[PDB]
Paper text:
By using the actin cytoskeleton as tracks, myosin also powers cellular cargo transport processes and can serve as a molecular anchor and force sensor. The myosin motor domain consists of four subdomains: the actin-binding upper and lower 50 kDa (U50 and L50) domains, which are separated by the central actin-binding cleft, the N-terminal domain, and the converter domain, containing the long α-helical extension known as the lever arm. The active site of myosin is located at the interface of the U50 domain and the N-terminal domain and is allosterically coupled to both the actin-binding interface and the lever arm. This coupling ultimately enables the amplification of small rearrangements at the active site to large, force-producing conformational changes of the lever arm.
Numbering used by the authors:
A (entry chain A): 5 to 33, 36 to 54, 57 to 186, 190 to 216
B (entry chain A): 649 to 792
C (entry chain B): 4 to 79, 86 to 97, 100 to 150
D (entry chain A): 433 to 504
């Protein structure tokens, strides 16, 4: 079976939601001899029934699309997002047709003008993910066919939905050839915040 | 009614830490946000299907390490259909598209693991042979 | 092994004896096995040695008589060729790729062993005729 | 081209009519998303000459009917 010595598994840990482990002896049908980083050695119960999530190989890890991963589960997704965000500072990622945007609180250069002209024309897979790539996929489908296009943004309001919309609109403005939609809409934002936003136990504004 | 008129495109936003730190990723908060954005359930729905797709040439390139020269053939598509049909027993796991192979979850990891095993054992055999041949020469040098 | 082979091997053993007590280290057992024409894996050497600990592997000394059954046990081409075509099948091998895989995969060797065996065998592009290199390392 | 800023699925130690309405809205949006993804994948399967009857569709209509249908 797929469980062997020198294989990696995810173990549940209450401090960090999953922890990596290596298997010290090959499994054969009720306990596993598990290595860790937190000490060399550990003995880990299996449960009446369960085997841990098996870890993807590192060619697939850090791919631009979560569905490139051969095993798909919460540990692989959480790890792959964490390594893209922490190591490469790639805040944008794909999952199926969804664009996952992980909000850095730090400001980035990547929104700068030239990249708008770099993404434009490029089919959605031909470039690494960025909000301009979805803005194009909409603008291109609008130009190609009759239909209007929609972009739908979800998450706790701190997460930066408004920043994503703002940059999508900058993409549209810069490709389309303008005047003063963007400045007016962002001027409207404080009004709609003041009359429509609220303070909730989990979240201010 | 307003959305149904229109073709959608989606963005999800996740808040990586509770305290606005510039790049700290808190896996508890990010797990909660990934559940609240339905990304994890979307991924569950995808993992049931064929999530993983490969173009026949890129497959052939990667698994030429596995492929035998007798298996190599004047039609790479037929070559890969044969090699894969041998390598993975249950046809339910995979499908042959016109230009892409489709795999259920794990099957590409299965191929990658058998590749790493074969390449490791072959590397061990060649390495031990070169180490023996050089040290055997040092043995003959000490004899001389 | 015949009496003549055992005598020649004992003489060789003493040539590898750097202390004069007629003994080698556990860590030398593998060296003697490969020097005597065997090609055991590191795993096979450690297995026939009984998975010795670092301390006794580096400082515990054994005479020829205890080593001998282990040498015997160790003692008792087309796969090698396909194995080399793995790392290419036009009869060449990248020098960079072979060096990387030999120093990073399997039972990793040092760069100096690879440089020693590879000296003069790679061309300007860095390609090795692996059938000739294989015959060379098996000779 | 129309850009929707909405709130996501929401749960607290205490959940109340506000959270119940937010969750019903998110159930509807998630249904639309699931149908759109299923349509695109059916088109890709018909494009690639696979039997499209294989692809499995996952439908939260029983929950929407629980919340909104008559005697919901």
């Amino acid at each position: 079976e797929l469980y062997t010595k020198y294989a990696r598994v995810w173990i549940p840990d209450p401090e960090e939601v999953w922890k990596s482990a290596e298997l010290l002896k090959d499994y054969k049908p009720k306990v596993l001899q598990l290595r860790l980083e937190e000490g060399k050695d550990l003995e880990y119960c299996l449960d009446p029934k369960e085997l841990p999530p098996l870890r993807n190989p590192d060619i697939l890890v850090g791919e631009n699309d979560l569905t490139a991963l051969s095993y798909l589960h919460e540990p692989a997704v959480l790890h792959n997002l964490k390594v893209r965000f922490i190591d490469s500072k790639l805040i944008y990622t794909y999952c199926g047709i969804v664009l996952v945007a992980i909000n850095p609180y730090e400001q980035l250069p990547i929104y700068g003008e030239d990249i708008i002209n770099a993404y434009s024309g490029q089919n959605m897979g031909d470039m690494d993910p960025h909000i301009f790539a979805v803005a194009e996929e909409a603008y291109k489908q609008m130009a190609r066919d009759e239909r209007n296009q929609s972009i739908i943004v979800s998450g706790e309001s701190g997460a930066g939905k408004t920043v994503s919309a703002k940059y999508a609109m900058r993409y549209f403005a810069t490709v389309s050839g303008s005047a003063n939609v963007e400045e007016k809409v962002l001027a409207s934002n404080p009004i709609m915040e003041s009359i429509g936003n609220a303070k909730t136990t989990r979240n201010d504004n | 009614e307003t959305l149904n008129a229109t073709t959608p495109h989606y963005v999800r936003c996740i808040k990586p830490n509770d305290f606005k730190f510039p790049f700290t990723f808190d896996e508890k908060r990010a797990v909660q946000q990934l559940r609240a954005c339905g990304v994890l359930e979307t991924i569950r729905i995808s993992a049931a299907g064929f999530p993983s797709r490969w173009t026949y040439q890129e497959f052939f390139s990667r698994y030429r390490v596995l492929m035998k020269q007798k298996d190599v053939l004047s039609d790479r598509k037929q070559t890969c259909k044969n090699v894969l049909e041998k390598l993975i027993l249950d046809k339910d796991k995979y499908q042959f598209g016109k230009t892409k192979i489709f795999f259920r979850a794990g099957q590409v990891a299965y191929l990658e693991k058998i590749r790493a095993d074969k390449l490791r054992a072959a590397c061990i055999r060649i390495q031990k042979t070169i180490r023996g041949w050089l040290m055997r020469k040092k043995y003959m040098r000490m004899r001389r | 092994f015949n009496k003549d082979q055992l005598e020649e091997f004992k003489e060789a053993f003493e040539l590898f004896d750097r202390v004069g007590d007629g003994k080698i280290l556990y860590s030398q057992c593998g060296d003697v096995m490969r020097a005597l024409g065997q090609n055991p894996t590191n795993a096979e050497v450690l297995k026939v040695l009984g998975n010795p600990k670092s301390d006794e592997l580096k400082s515990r000394r054994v005479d020829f008589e205890t080593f001998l059954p282990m040498l015997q046990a160790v003692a008792k081409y087309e796969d090698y060729l396909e194995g080399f075509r793995v790392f290419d099948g036009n009869g060449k091998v990248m020098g960079a790729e072979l060096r990387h895989v030999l120093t990073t995969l399997g039972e990793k060797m040092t760069e100096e062993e690879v440089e020693t065996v590879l000296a003069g065998h790679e061309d300007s592009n860095g390609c090795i005729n692996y059938e000739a290199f294989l015959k060379h390392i098996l000779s | 081209i129309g850009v929707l800023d909405i709130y996501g699925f929401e749960t607290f130690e205490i959940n109340s009519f506000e959270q119940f309405c937010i969750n019903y809205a998110n159930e509807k949006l998630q249904q639309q998303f699931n149908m759109h993804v299923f349509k695109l994948e059916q088109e890709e399967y018909m494009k690639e000459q696979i039997p499209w009857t294989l692809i499995d569709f996952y439908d939260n209509q029983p929950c929407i009917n629980l919340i909104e249908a008559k005697m919901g």
